[PDB]
PDB file of C-alpha atoms in Angstrom:
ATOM      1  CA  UNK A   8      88.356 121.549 104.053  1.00  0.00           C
ATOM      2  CA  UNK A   9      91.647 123.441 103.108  1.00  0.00           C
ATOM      3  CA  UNK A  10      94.275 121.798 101.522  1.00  0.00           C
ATOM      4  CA  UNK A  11      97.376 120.571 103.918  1.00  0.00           C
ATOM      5  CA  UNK A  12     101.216 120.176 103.999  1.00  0.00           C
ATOM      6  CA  UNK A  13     102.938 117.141 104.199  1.00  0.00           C
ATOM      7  CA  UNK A  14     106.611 116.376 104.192  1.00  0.00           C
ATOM      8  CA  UNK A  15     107.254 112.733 102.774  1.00  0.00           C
ATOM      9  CA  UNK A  16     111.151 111.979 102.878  1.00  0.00           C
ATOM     10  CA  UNK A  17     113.022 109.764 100.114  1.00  0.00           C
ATOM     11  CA  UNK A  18     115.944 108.243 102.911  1.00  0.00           C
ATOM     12  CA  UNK A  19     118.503 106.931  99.944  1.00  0.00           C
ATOM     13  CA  UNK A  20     120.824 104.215 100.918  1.00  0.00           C
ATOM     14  CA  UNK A  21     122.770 102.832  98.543  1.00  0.00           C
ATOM     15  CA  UNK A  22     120.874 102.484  95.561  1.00  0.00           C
ATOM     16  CA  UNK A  23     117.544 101.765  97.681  1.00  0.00           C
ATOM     17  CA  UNK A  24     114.839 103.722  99.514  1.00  0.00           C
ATOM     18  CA  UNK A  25     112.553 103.446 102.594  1.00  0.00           C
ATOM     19  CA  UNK A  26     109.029 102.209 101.728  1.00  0.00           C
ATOM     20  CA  UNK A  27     106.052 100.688 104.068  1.00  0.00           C
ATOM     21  CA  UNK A  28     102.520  99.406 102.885  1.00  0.00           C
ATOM     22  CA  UNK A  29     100.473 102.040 104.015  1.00  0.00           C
ATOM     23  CA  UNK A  30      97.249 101.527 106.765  1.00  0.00           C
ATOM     24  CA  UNK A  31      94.881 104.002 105.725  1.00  0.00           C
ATOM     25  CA  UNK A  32      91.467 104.674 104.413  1.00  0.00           C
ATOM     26  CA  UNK A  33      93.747 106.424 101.345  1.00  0.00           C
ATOM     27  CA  UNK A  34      95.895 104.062  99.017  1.00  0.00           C
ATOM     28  CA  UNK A  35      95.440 101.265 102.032  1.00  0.00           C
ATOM     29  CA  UNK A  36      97.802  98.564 101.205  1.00  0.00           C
ATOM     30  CA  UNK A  37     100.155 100.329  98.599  1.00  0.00           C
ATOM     31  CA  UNK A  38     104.013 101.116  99.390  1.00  0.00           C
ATOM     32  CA  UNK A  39     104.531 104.807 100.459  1.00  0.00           C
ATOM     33  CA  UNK A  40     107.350 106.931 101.993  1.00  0.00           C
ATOM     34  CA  UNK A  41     107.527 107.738 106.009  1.00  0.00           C
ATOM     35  CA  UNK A  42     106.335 111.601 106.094  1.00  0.00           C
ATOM     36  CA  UNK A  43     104.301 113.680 108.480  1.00  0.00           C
ATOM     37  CA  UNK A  44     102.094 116.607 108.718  1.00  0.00           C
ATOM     38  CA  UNK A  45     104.365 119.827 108.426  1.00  0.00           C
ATOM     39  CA  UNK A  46     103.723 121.855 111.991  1.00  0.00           C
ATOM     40  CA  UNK A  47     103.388 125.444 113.018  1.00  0.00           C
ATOM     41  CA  UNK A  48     106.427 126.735 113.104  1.00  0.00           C
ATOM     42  CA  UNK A  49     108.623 124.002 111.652  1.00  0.00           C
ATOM     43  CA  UNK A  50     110.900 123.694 108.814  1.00  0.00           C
ATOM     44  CA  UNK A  51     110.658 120.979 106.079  1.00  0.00           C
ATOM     45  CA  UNK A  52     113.962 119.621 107.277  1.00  0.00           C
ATOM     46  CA  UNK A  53     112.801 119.043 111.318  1.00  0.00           C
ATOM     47  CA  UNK A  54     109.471 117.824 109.769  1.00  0.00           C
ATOM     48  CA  UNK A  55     111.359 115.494 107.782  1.00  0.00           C
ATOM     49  CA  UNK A  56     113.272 114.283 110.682  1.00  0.00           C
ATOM     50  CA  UNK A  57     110.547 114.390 113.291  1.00  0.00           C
ATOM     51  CA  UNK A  58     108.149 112.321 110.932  1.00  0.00           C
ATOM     52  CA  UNK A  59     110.810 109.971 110.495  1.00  0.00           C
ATOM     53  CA  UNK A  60     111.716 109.344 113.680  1.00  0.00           C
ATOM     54  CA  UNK A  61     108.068 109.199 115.046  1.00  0.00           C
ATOM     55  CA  UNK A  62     107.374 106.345 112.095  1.00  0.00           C
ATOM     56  CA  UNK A  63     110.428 104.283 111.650  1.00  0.00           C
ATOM     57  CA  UNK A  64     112.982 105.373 114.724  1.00  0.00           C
ATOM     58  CA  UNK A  65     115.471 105.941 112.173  1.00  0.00           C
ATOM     59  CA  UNK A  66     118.049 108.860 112.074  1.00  0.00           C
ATOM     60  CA  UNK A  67     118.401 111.252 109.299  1.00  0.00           C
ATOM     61  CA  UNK A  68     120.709 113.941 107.867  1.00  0.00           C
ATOM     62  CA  UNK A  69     121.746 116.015 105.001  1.00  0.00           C
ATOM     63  CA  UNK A  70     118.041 116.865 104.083  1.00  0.00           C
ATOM     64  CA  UNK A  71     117.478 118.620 101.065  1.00  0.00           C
ATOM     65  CA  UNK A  72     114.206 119.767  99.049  1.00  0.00           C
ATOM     66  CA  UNK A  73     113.234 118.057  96.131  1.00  0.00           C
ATOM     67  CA  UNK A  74     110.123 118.943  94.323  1.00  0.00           C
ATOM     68  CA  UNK A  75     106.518 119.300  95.549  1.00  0.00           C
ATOM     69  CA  UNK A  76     103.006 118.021  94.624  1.00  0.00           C
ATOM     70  CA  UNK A  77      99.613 118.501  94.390  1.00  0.00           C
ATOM     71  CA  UNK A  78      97.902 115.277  95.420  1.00  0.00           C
ATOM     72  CA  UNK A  79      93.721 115.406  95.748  1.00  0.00           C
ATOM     73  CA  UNK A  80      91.878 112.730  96.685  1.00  0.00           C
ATOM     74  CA  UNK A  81      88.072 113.703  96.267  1.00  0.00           C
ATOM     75  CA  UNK A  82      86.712 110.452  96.731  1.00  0.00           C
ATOM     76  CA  UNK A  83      88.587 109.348 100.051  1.00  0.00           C
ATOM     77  CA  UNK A  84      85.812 108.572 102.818  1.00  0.00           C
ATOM     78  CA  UNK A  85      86.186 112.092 104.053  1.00  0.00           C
ATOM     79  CA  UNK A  86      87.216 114.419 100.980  1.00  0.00           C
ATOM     80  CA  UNK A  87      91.215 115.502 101.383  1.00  0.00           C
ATOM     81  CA  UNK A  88      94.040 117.931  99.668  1.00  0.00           C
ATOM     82  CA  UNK A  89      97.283 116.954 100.326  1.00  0.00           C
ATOM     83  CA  UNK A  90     100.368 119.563  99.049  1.00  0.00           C
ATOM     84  CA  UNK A  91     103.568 117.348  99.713  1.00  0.00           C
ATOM     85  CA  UNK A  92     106.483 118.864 100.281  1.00  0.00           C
ATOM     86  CA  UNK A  93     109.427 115.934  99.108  1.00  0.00           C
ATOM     87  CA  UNK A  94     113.185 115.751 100.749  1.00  0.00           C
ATOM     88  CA  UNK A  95     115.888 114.030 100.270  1.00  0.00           C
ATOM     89  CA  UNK A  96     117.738 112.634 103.374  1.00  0.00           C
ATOM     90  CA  UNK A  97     120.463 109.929 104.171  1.00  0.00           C
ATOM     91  CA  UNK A  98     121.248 107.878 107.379  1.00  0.00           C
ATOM     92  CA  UNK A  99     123.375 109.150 110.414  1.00  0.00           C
ATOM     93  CA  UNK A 100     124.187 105.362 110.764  1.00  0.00           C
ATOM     94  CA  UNK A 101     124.163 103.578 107.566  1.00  0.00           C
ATOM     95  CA  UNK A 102     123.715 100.684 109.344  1.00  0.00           C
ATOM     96  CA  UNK A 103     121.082 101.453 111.569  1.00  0.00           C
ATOM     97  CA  UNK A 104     117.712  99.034 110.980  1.00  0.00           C
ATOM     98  CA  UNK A 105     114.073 100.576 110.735  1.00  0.00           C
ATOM     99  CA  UNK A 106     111.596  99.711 113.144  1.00  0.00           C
ATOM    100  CA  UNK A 107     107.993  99.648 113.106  1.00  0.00           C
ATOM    101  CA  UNK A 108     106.930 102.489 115.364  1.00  0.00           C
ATOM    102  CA  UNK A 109     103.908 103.655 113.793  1.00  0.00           C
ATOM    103  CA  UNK A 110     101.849  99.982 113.458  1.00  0.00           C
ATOM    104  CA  UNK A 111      98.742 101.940 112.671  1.00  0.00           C
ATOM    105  CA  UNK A 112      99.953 104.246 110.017  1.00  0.00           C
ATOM    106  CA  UNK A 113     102.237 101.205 108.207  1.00  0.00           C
ATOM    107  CA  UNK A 114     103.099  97.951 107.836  1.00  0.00           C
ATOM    108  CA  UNK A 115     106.709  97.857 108.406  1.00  0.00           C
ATOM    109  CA  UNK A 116     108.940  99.638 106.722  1.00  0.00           C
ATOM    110  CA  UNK A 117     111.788  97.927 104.344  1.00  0.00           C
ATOM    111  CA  UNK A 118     114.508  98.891 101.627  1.00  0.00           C
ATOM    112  CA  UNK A 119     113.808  98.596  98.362  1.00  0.00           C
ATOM    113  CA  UNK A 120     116.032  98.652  94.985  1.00  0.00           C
ATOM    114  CA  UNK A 121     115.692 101.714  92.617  1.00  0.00           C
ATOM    115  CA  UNK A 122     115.171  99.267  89.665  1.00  0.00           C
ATOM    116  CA  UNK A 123     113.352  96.419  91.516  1.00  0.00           C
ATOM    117  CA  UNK A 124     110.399  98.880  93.426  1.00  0.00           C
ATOM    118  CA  UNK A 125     107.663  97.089  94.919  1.00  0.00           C
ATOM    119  CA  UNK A 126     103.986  97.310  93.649  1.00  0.00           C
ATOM    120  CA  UNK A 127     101.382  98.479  94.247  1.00  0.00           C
ATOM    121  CA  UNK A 128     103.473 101.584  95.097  1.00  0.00           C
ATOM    122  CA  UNK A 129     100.706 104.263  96.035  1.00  0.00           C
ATOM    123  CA  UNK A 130      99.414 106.508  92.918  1.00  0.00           C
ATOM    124  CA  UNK A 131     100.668 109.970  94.124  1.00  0.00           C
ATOM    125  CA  UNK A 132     104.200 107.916  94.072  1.00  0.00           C
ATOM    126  CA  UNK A 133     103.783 105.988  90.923  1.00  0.00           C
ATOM    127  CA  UNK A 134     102.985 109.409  89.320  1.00  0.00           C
ATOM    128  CA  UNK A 135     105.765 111.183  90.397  1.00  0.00           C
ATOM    129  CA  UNK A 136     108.201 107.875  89.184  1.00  0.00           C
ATOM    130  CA  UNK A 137     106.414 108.410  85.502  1.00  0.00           C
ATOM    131  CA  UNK A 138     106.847 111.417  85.301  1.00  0.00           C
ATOM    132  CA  UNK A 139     110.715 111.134  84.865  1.00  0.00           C
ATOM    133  CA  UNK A 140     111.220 112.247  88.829  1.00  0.00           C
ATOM    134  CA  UNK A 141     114.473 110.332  90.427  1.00  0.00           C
ATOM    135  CA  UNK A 142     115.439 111.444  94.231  1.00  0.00           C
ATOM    136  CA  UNK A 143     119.021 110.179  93.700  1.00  0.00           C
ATOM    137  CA  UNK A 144     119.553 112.960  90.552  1.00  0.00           C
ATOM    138  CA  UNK A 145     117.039 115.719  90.787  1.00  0.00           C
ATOM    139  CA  UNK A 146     118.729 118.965  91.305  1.00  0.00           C
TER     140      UNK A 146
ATOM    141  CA  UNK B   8      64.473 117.813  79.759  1.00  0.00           C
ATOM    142  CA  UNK B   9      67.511 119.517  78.409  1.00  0.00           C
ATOM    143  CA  UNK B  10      71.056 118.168  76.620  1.00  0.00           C
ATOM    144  CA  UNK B  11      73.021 116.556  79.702  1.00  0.00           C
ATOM    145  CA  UNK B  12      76.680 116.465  79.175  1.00  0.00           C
ATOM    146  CA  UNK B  13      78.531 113.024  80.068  1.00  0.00           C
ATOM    147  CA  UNK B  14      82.284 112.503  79.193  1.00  0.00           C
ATOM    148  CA  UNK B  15      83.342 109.126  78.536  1.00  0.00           C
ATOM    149  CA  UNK B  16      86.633 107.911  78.064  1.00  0.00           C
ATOM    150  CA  UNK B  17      89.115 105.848  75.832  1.00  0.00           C
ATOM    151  CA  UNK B  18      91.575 104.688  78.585  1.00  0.00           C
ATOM    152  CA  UNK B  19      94.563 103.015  75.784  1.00  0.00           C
ATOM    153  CA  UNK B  20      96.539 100.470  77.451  1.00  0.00           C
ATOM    154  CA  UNK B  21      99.120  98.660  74.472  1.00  0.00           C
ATOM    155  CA  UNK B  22      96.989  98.726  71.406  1.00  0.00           C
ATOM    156  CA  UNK B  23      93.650  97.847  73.325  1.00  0.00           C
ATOM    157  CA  UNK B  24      90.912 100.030  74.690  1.00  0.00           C
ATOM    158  CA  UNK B  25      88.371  99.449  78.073  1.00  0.00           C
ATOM    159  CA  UNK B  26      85.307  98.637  77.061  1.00  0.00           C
ATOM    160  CA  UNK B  27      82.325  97.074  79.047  1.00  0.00           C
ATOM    161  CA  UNK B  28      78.558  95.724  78.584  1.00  0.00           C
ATOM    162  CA  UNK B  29      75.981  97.863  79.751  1.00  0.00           C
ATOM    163  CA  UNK B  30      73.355  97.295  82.255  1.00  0.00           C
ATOM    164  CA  UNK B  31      70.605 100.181  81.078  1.00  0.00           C
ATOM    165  CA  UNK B  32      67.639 101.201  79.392  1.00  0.00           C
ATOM    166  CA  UNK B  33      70.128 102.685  76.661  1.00  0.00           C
ATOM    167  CA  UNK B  34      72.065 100.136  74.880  1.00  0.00           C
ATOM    168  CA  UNK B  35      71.421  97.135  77.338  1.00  0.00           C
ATOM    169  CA  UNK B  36      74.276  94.329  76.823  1.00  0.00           C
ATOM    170  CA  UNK B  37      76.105  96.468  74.092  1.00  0.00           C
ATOM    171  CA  UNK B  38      80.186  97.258  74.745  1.00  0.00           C
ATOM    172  CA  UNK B  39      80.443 101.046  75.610  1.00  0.00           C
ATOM    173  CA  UNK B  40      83.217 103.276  77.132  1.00  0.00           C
ATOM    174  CA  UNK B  41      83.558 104.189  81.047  1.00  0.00           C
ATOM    175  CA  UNK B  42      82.410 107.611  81.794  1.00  0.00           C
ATOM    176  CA  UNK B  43      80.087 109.373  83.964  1.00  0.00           C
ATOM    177  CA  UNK B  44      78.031 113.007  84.353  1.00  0.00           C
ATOM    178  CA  UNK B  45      79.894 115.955  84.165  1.00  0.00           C
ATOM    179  CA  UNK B  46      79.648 118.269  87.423  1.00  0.00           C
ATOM    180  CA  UNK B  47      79.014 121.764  88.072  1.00  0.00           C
ATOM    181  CA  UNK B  48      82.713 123.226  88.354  1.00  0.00           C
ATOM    182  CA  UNK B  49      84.080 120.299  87.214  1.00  0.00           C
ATOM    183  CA  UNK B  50      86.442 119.822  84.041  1.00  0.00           C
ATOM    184  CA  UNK B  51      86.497 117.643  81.320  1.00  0.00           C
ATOM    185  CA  UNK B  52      89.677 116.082  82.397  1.00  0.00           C
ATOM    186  CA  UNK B  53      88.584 115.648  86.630  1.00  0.00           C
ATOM    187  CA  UNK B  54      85.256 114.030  85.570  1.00  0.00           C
ATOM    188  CA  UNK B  55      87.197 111.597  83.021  1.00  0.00           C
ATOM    189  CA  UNK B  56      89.478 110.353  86.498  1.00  0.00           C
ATOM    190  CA  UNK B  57      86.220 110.419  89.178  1.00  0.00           C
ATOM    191  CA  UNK B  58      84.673 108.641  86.741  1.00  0.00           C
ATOM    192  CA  UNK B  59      87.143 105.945  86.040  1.00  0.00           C
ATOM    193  CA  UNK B  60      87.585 105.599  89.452  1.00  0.00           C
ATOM    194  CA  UNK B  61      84.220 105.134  90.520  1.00  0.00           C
ATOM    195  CA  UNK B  62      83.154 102.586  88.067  1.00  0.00           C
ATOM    196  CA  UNK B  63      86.541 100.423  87.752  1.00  0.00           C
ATOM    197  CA  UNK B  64      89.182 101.532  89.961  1.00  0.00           C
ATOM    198  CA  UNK B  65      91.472 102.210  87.475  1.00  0.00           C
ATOM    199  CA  UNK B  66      93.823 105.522  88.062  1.00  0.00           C
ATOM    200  CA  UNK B  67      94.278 107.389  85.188  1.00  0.00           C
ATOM    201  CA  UNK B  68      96.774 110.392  83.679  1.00  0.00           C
ATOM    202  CA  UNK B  69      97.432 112.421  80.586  1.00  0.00           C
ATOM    203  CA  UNK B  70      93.659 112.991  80.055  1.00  0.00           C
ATOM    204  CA  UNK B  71      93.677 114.719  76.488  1.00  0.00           C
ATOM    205  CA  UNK B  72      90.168 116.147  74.943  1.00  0.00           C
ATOM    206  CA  UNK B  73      89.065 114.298  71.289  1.00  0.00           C
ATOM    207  CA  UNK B  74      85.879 115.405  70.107  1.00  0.00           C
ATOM    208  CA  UNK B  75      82.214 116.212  71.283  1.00  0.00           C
ATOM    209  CA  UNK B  76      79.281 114.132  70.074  1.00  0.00           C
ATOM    210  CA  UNK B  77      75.222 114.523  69.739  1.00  0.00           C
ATOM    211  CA  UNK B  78      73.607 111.702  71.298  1.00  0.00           C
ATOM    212  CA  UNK B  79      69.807 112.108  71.296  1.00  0.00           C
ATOM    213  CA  UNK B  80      67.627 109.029  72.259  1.00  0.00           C
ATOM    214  CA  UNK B  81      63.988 110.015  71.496  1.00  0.00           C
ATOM    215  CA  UNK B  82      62.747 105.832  71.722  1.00  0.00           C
ATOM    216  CA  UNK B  83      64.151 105.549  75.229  1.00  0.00           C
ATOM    217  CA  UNK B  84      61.918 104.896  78.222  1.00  0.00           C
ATOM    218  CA  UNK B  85      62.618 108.358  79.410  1.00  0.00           C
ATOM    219  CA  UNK B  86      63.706 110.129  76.769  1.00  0.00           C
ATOM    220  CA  UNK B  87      66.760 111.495  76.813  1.00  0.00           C
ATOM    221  CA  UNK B  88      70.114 113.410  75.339  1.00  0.00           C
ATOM    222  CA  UNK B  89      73.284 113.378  75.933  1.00  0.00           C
ATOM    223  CA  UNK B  90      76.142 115.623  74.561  1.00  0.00           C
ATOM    224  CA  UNK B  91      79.062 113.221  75.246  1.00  0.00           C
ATOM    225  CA  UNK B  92      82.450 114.592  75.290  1.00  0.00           C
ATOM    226  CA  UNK B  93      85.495 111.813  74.797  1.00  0.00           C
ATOM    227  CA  UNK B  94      88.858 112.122  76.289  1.00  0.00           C
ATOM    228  CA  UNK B  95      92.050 110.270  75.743  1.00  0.00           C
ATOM    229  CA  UNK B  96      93.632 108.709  78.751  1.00  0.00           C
ATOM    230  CA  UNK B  97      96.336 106.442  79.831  1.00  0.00           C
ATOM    231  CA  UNK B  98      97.052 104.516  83.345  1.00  0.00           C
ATOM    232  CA  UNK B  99      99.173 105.897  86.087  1.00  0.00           C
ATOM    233  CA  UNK B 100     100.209 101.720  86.980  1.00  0.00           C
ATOM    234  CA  UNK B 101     100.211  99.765  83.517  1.00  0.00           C
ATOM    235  CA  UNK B 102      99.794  96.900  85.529  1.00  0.00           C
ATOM    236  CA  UNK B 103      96.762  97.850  87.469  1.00  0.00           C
ATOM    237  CA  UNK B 104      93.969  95.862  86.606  1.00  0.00           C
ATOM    238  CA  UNK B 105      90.283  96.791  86.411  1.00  0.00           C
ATOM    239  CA  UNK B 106      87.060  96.161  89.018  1.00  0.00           C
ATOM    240  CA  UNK B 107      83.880  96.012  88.405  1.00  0.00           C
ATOM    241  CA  UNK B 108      82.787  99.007  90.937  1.00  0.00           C
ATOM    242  CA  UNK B 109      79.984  99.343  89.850  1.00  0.00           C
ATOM    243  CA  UNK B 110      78.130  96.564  88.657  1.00  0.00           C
ATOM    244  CA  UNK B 111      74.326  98.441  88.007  1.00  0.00           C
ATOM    245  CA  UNK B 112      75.840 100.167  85.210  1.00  0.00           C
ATOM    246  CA  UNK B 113      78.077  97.392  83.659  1.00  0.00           C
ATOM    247  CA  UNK B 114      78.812  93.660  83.405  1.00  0.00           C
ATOM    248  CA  UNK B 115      82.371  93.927  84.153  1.00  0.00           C
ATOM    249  CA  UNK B 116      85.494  95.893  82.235  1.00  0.00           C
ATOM    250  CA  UNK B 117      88.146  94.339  79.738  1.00  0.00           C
ATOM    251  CA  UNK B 118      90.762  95.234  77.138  1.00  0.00           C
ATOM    252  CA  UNK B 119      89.849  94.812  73.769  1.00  0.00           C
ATOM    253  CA  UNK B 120      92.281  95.246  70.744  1.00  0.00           C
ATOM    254  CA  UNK B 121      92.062  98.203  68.435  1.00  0.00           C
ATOM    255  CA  UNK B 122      91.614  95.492  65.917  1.00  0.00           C
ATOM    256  CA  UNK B 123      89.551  92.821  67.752  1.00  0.00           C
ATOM    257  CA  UNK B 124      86.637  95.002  68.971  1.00  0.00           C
ATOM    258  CA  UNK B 125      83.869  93.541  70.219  1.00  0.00           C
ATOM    259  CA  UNK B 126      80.379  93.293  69.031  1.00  0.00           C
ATOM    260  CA  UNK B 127      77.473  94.753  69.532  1.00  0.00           C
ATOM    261  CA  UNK B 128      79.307  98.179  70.333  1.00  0.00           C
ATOM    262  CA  UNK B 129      77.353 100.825  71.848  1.00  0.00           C
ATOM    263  CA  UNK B 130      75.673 102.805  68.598  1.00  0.00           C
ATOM    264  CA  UNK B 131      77.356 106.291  69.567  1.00  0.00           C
ATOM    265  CA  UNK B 132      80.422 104.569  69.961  1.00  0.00           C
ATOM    266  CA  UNK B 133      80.259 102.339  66.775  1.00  0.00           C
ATOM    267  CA  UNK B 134      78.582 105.224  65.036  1.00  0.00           C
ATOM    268  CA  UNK B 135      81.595 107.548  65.773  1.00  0.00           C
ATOM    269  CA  UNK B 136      83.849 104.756  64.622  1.00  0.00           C
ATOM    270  CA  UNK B 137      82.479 104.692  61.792  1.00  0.00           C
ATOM    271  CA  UNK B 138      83.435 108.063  61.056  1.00  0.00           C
ATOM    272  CA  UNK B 139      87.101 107.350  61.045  1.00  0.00           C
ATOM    273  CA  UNK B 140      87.782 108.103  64.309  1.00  0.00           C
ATOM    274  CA  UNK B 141      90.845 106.617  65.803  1.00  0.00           C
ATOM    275  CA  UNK B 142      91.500 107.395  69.860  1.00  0.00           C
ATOM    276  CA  UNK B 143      94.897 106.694  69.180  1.00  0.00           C
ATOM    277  CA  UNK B 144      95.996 108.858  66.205  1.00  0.00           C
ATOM    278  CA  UNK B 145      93.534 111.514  66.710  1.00  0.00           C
TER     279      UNK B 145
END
């Protein structure tokens, strides 16, 4: 039981981002971000990538690190530490749709407004939001 | 035995606090705070959010110590004492609403107004009201 790294990706288009009601013994239910485990080897910018692709088919550039977080979760059915890594990313082509390629991680995967977010949005996610965090600004 | 430490917790939401009936020995049917046993390791502030969580599903931030209070119960069916420390918190959704997680320890959670509380409190919590103390000012 050591903690782990995830990368989860904020894909901004327009004034919206990529969310998906999580399947999952954690926050099951609750709008998240596509994201992956971070690999041997690999940089947060092909994790990004690689996580979205693997989850949504969608094709991202321009990735760029955020902030990071320290999310436990001691009463999950087994016990997990999650230290997620955040990037910023945009579309190769704006218009390209998301697809569901993951049905056992996620729902589907949609675009939602920066001032009309879904809820429940998953608590590591709210947190970060009330904190003050915004992907389109921080710097 | 020997002094067990609980913290128990004044989650504010608005101008209203959580409060609930217990089902126990101690205080059966009187309004008391959610809160739990206090861990080896643990701090104040992680037992104040397990707990939460385990009895009402409620996610919590901000946790803030208050104060530390003497509860001794000589007349209960065990005896027993409790040194309960009381921490300030707020909710991570303010539009989350509570559960009843577990319901052999409470009747079920509600708000209650600052100014509307209900009656019969818990004694350690009316008894520390009765001091002056205010969760929200203090």
């Amino acid at each position: 039981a050591i903690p782990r790294v995830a990368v989860v990706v904020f894909i901004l288009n327009g004034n919206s981002i990529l969310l998906g009601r999580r399947r999952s013994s954690i926050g099951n239910s609750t709008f998240a971000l596509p994201g992956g485990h971070l690999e041997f080897g690999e940089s947060f910018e092909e994790c990004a990538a690689r996580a979205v692709m693997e989850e949504t088919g969608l094709k991202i550039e321009k990735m760029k690190l955020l902030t990071v977080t320290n999310n436990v979760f001691k009463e999950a059915p087994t016990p997990s530490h999650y230290v997620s890594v955040s990037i910023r990313a945009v579309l190769v082509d704006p218009s390209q749709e998301p697809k569901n390629m993951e049905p056992e991680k996620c729902e589907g995967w949609d675009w939602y407004d920066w001032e009309n977010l879904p809820k429940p949005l998953f608590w590591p996610l709210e947190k970060l939001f009330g904190s003050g965090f915004n992907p389109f600004t921080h710097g």
